[PDB]
Amino acid sequence: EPARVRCSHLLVKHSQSRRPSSWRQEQITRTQEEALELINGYIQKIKSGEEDFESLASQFSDCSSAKARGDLGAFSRGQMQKPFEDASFALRTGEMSGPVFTDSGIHIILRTE
Numbered sequence: 001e002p003a004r005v006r007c008s009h010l011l012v013k014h015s016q017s018r019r020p021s022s023w024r025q026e027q028i029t030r031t032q033e034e035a036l037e038l039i040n041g042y043i044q045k046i047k048s049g050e051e052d053f054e055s056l057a058s059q060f061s062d063c064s065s066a067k068a069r070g071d072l073g074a075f076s077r078g079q080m081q082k083p084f085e086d087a088s089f090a091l092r093t094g095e096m097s098g099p100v101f102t103d104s105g106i107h108i109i110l111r112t113e
């Protein structure tokens with residue numbers, strides 16, 4: 001395991017998220033169910049090749065990292081929310097996670113380094 005990994009992510013918030021607002025929406029109104037539907041729709045499009053992970057993150061991620069095409073840069077353990085950390089360190093470089101749940105909402109993660 002490396003000391004740090006570098007990942008990109010696409011976050012879909014919902015009305016029960018810790019901070020239910022984003023750069024793209026003043027108030028997050030969608031349900032948890034709708035957020036998971038959106039995440040699964042993105043996974044299917046990335047798997048078929050219909051959509052690019054970083055291109056989707058740049059315009060649809062509820063995280064301010066959308067401006068960096070989803071890039072969070074490098075992080076060690078003990079920094080990010082634990083389920084996000086565990087999912088990130090379990091990926092190989094160039095691998096994408098399935099849905100990941102944190103207090104911020106639902107994420108898809110792409111490990112880059």
Ligand SMILES: O=C(N[C@H](Cc1nc2ccc(F)cc2[nH]1)C(=O)O)c1ccc2ccccc2c1
Pocket residue numbers: 009011019021022062063064065068071072073080081082084085102104
């Ligand atoms: O907290 C941030 N944005 C939060 C959403 C969020 N991003 C997350 C990433 C990992 C995780 F475990 C939980 C998350 N909740 C926000 O914009 O409300 C955030 C964190 C680190 C960043 C690093 C680089 C660029 C933007 C960042 C935004």
